[PDB]
């Protein structure tokens with residue numbers, strides 16, 4: 558079951 | 568005149584980097600919506616009030632079937648709130664989790680719809696989404712795609728006009744972005760390769776929990792092609808994940824149109840996609856509006872001048 562990713566902005 | 572007292576708060580549908588999303592009911596109309604609620608505090612703290620204005624503005628100016636409508640933006644003393652049309656068939660992350668893999672025909676349907684909306688964003692709003700991921704993809708009551716979340720959009724991009732902000736989601740970043748080069752709209756097409764690849768293949772094309780390793784893969788290695796892929800499919804993913812944006816499908820002057828013509832989408836009729844005359848290969852089975860079977864249960868189950876005014880935030884629709 559693939560883990561959720563997280564968006565980011567530098 | 569909208570505030571929080573104008574809704575009832577029924578279910579938590581999701582949580583995370585993006586604040587909290589709640590299935591609410593408008594008191595005066597009985598209508599259901601998804602209310603995405605941010606705390607003003609975290610938003611200053613991450614120097615990103617610009618993202619929220621960007622999202623507000625991208626939502627007010629978009630009308631498109633495969634982008635979630637905004638009905639209200641309102642703020643309070645402590646929160647920002649986006650009341651959006653509720654996508655009642657759930658997260659596509661949810662669904663691909665249960666099924667592992669989609670059929671070619673099913674991945675084709677969704678991908679058609681994503682191209683539709685992204686071609687819209689690009690050629691009509693001059694917007695580059697930048698954060699296409701499975702997690703940003705909902706389904707409505709009839710099984711049509713809804714893209715949500717516009718905080719990381721770039722506005723005012725025309726032709727090959729470029730951008731430099733390093734952002735997105737690590738697993739989806741396009742090579743030219745890892746490369747610290749100026750990039751244009753072909754990013755969105757790279758993102759679409761990764762999502763199609765995920766739907767048809769059952770895993771991301773590049774994966775490591777270690778980012779340095781994850782980035783080196785994206786730059787250095789060719790995709791693997793499972794032997795269950797038909798030759799049209801090997802061809803669309805191969806073309807969408809050309810590491811050079813200049814060689815990528817959708818990366819010339821004709822943008823989405825180079826993808827609509829590709830033989831994978833042969834006998835997809837694009838105006839029919841747009842007009843919603845194609846049968847969704849999966850009709851969500853919901854038993855009422857309040858039924859959240861397709862939302863994930865870690866959530867369903869739950870239930871100063873760091874707090875400034877956001878100017879002209881507040882909005883109410885009326886096309």
Ligand SMILES: Cc1nnc(-c2ccccc2Nc2ncnc3[nH]ccc23)[nH]1
Nearest residue numbers: 580581585588601635651652653654716
């Ligand atoms: C980013 C991001 N924004 N929202 C989510 C999200 C995550 C999990 C479950 C539901 C979500 N949102 C929604 N679920 C139903 N309908 C909706 N309309 C608009 C949004 C929405 N993610």
